[PDB]
């Protein structure tokens, strides 16, 4: 098993600026036939993997020449002379020299855009759900950047940390923002013992947490 | 247009069998070696099996050897993966992949077919309303298995301002939410309904969002 190691794991790049990714293999990828079977692949969000580079430096014919590849032996580099919006995704190196075929762990490239505050919405459990014995309080945090965000739940003032499930979207191709949902699920009886439910978002775009609340009374 | 279209993926019990297919078009299929590569939840890619264009020679990863069989039917331009003794560690998106002997690497990949190995049972979703210049509404789709579900708003006529979040797996059951944002002057004066479908359980639910 030839180990393929990529650095960095994540890359945040501005449109128009250069970027590069390093791939290192645990042993030489030079084949006995004298060729070096080192390949690069891009998987866009929700899309099929697409070949970028093969044989170290050969450019796939569907790929623009702002992509180049170099290296030899155990050390290889993918370079992008100028980033474009559609470059968002997972980049993988992989080797075809040794059996079995092995892949690097991937590098996530995301597009750097202007900071944007989340639009926060909070929703009480529906009456329908309460009849099941459960109660989910849902908080949407939509269209923010950067993706680094912290959501905290408070019930009657006290911080609550579980029954909480969070889900993040990948970067939106339309506006380069992220969205996430945080859902706090309690038993019906637990939910009805308290009045105030609060969703608190900490993000670099405000000097204080962005807060949405409701009272079970109203 | 070289195209590879995998099918056959779905929920399968631990220890059971499942056969994947990959229909190839836009090239002379019999001339090419083919492989299966799988991608797990961590987005890690792992080669599975390969079959040559000639002589029917086959190759397997140490993880699937003795359990999987790769084969081809050139008369149907189709690649197969017969899986047996399946286990949780086999859960993945499975891709059909062409090796291009002219350029010296695998080139084209399909869209993938999803295999879920689990003893948990197919379970229909519960669909709950999420009600409070623009107003954001939503639907909570809870307790279903396996993936996927689809969620539209007003049968698709409401497309802008919609977010559907990736499902999260909580106790062998999936949950997701979808949000939709409309002008406040259109709700609740006009109706807003989320349409949820769960093909695996032959379920279709329409939940109108009514003010609290």
């Amino acid at each position: 098993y030839v180990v393929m190691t990529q650095t960095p794991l994540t890359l945040s790049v501005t449109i128009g600026q250069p970027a590069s990714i390093s791939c290192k293999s645990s042993q030489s990828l030079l084949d006995s036939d004298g060729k070096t079977y080192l390949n690069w692949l891009l998987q866009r969000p929700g899309q099929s993997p697409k070949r970028l580079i093969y044989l170290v430096s050969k450019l796939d014919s569907g790929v623009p020449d702002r992509f180049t590849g170099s290296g030899s032996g155990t050390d290889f580099t993918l370079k992008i002379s100028r980033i474009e919006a559609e470059d968002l995704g997972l980049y993988y190196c992989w080797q075809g020299t040794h059996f079995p075929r092995t892949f690097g762990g991937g590098t996530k490239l995301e597009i750097k855009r202007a900071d944007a505050a989340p639009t926060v919405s909070i929703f009480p459990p529906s009456s329908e759900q309460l009849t099941s014995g459960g109660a989910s309080v849902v908080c949407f945090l939509n269209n923010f950047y950067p993706k680094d965000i912290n959501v905290k739940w408070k019930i009657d003032g006290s911080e609550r940390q579980n029954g909480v499930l969070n889900s993040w979207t990948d970067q939106d191709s339309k506006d380069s923002t992220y969205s996430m949902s945080s859902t706090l699920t309690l038993t019906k009886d637990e939910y009805e013992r308290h009045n105030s439910y609060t969703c608190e978002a900490t993000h670099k775009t405000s000097t204080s947490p962005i807060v949405k609340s409701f009272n079970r009374n109203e | 247009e070289v195209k590879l279209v995998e099918s056959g993926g779905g929920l399968v019990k631990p220890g059971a069998s499942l056969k994947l297919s990959c229909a190839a078009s836009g090239f002379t299929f019999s001339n090419y070696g083919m492989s299966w590569v799988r991608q797990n939840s961590d987005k890690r890619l792992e080669w599975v099996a390969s079959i040559r264009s000639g002589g029917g020679r086959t190759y397997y990863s140490d993880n699937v050897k003795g359990r999987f069989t790769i084969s081809r039917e050139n008369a149907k331009n189709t690649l197969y993966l017969q899986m047996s003794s399946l286990k949780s560690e086999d859960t993945a998106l499975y891709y059909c992949v062409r090796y291009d002997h002219y350029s010296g690497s695998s080139d084209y990949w399909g869209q993938g077919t999803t295999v879920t190995v689990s003893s948990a049972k197919t379970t229909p979703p519960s669909v709950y309303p999420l009600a409070p210049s623009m107003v954001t509404l939503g639907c909570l789709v809870k307790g279903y298995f396996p993936e996927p579900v689809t969620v539209t708003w007003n049968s698709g006529s409401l497309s802008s301002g919609v977010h559907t979040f990736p499902a999260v797996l909580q106790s062998d059951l999936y949950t997701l939410s979808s949000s939709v944002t409309v002008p406040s002057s259109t709700w609740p004066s006009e109706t807003v309904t989320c349409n949820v479908a769960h093909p695996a359980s032959s379920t279709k639910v329409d939940k109108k969002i009514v003010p609290r």
């Binding site: 036939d33 075929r101 | 040559r52």
Partner: peptide, 6 residues
């Protein structure tokens, strides 16, 4: 890919 070249 090596398997296709042996």
């Amino acid at each position: 890919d090596a398997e296709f070249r042996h």
